[PDB]
Symmetry: C3
Subunit: 151 residues, 3 copies
C-alpha cells in the first residue's frame, strides 16, 4: 500500500512537471524558435560566415539548420522571414563539387533549389543559403548569413 | 523489483523537479516575468499592433493582457527594463469607447492614466502601458514593445 | 501486477520528459548561456554598472557570475568572447581592501588575475571584470560591463 501511495504521489508530480514544461516550451520558442516535428530550429539572431556559424551550432550541441522535408523547410523559412535575413543551411559541396551533403556526408534527401541553382557562381559557391521565399541558393561560405541551428 | 524501480523513478522525478526549477529561472532571465500562472515575455523589439498581435498568436500566446494590479506590475517590470512602452492586447476597435480583450469580453481591470482613454485625433483604438505602469489608448499603427503572455 | 504496469507506464512518461527537457535545455542555452557542471551562466546581452548588474541577477533568482574553478571560468569566458564584452564577476573587496570575496563574504577559492592585478588603480577598483582572454582585472564598480548571471 506504501509503494501504491508513492506511485500515486509520483503521478501527480509528473502531471505537474508535464503541464509546467508545456508552458515553458512555448515561452522558450518565442520569438527565435520554431518547432517542427521532433526538430527545433532556433536562430541566434545575428549573421556569421559559414565556418563560424557551424561552430556555434555544433558547440551548442546541435548543428546548422538542415531541413529534410517541405515541412521543415517551411518552419525554417518562418524564422528567416521573421528576421528578414537569409540563413545558412548545414549542407555544402566542399568535398566534391556539385555533390551537396549533410555534415555527416550523407546525400540530400530533400532540396528546394531556386531555378538554375546550384550554379557554383564564380566557381566558388560551396555553401547553401535559404531565402525569405524558402528557396535555396549555393553561396560562398565566406559570406555572412543568419545563424540558425537545429536541435 | 518494483520497490527498486519505484525508488529509481522517484529519484528521476526529484532530479527533474530540481533541474526544471533551475531552467525556469534561466529562461525568464532577462526577458520574462512570472506572475501567478501567467508568464509575460518580451520579444525585445517594437512592432505596430497588428504585427505584434500576430507574433504572439503564432507563438501560441497573445499580447500582454494584465487583469490585475499584480499582473500589471509584472508587465511593467519588463517595460521598465527595456525602457519602452508596450502594447497591451485590448482595443476598442469594435465599439469606440469600449475596450475589450481579444476574445470580446469587457475589461475586468484597467490602469488608465488620468484622462485616458481619450481617443486623441479620433484614432486611438489600441492600448500602451508606460514605464510607470499606467495605460494610454494609442494609435494601432504606432510601434511599441512586443510583449506576449503565455 | 497492476502497480508494476503503472510504474512501467510512468517511467516511460518520465524518460520521455527527460529527453524533451534535455533538448529544450540545449535550445535554451543557445546562444546566450553556458552550462558547466550543475551551474548555468547566462548573459543578459547588455552592459550595466556593477550594482545594477548585481540586482538584475539577484532579482532573477541567481547572482553575478562567480567562476570557482578553471572549468567554470572557461565556460564563462565563452560568453564574454561570444559577446566580445568584458563581464563583471560577483566578487568585490569593498569591505576590506585587497581581500576579494563572494557575495556571501567567503574568500576566493579560485582566481585568474591578469599579470599585475588586482592593483586597485586610482585607489578605487573594488569590482572584478573578466576579459575575453578569461583573465581578471579589478575594475571600478561604476564602469559598465557585460551582465552575466549564474543559476
Ligand atoms: Ca529561452
Ligand atoms: Ca567547390
Ligand atoms: Ca559548389
Ligand atoms: Ca548560386
Ligand atoms: Ca475607433
Ligand atoms: Ca478609441
Ligand atoms: Ca490617448
Ligand atoms: Ca577599496
Ligand atoms: Ca580594491
Ligand atoms: Ca586593475
Amino acid at each position: 500500500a506504501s509503494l501504491r501511495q508513492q506511485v500515486e504521489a509520483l503521478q501527480g508530480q509528473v502531471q505537474h512537471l508535464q503541464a509546467a514544461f508545456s508552458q515553458y516550451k512555448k515561452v522558450e520558442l518565442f520569438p527565435n524558435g520554431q518547432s517542427v516535428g521532433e526538430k527545433i530550429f532556433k536562430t541566434a539572431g545575428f549573421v556569421k560566415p559559414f565556418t563560424e556559424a557551424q561552430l556555434l551550432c555544433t558547440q551548442a550541441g546541435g548543428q546548422l539548420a538542415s531541413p529534410r522535408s517541405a515541412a521543415e523547410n517551411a518552419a525554417l523559412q518562418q524564422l528567416v522571414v521573421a528576421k528578414n535575413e537569409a540563413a545558412f543551411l548545414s549542407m555544402t559541396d566542399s568535398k566534391t563539387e556539385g555533390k551537396f551533403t549533410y555534415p555527416t556526408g550523407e546525400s540530400l534527401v530533400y532540396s528546394n533549389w531556386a531555378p538554375g541553382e546550384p550554379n557554383d557562381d564564380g566557381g566558388s559557391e560551396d555553401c547553401v543559403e535559404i531565402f525569405t521565399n524558402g528557396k535555396w541558393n549555393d553561396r560562398a561560405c565566406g559570406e555572412k548569413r543568419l545563424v540558425v541551428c537545429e536541435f
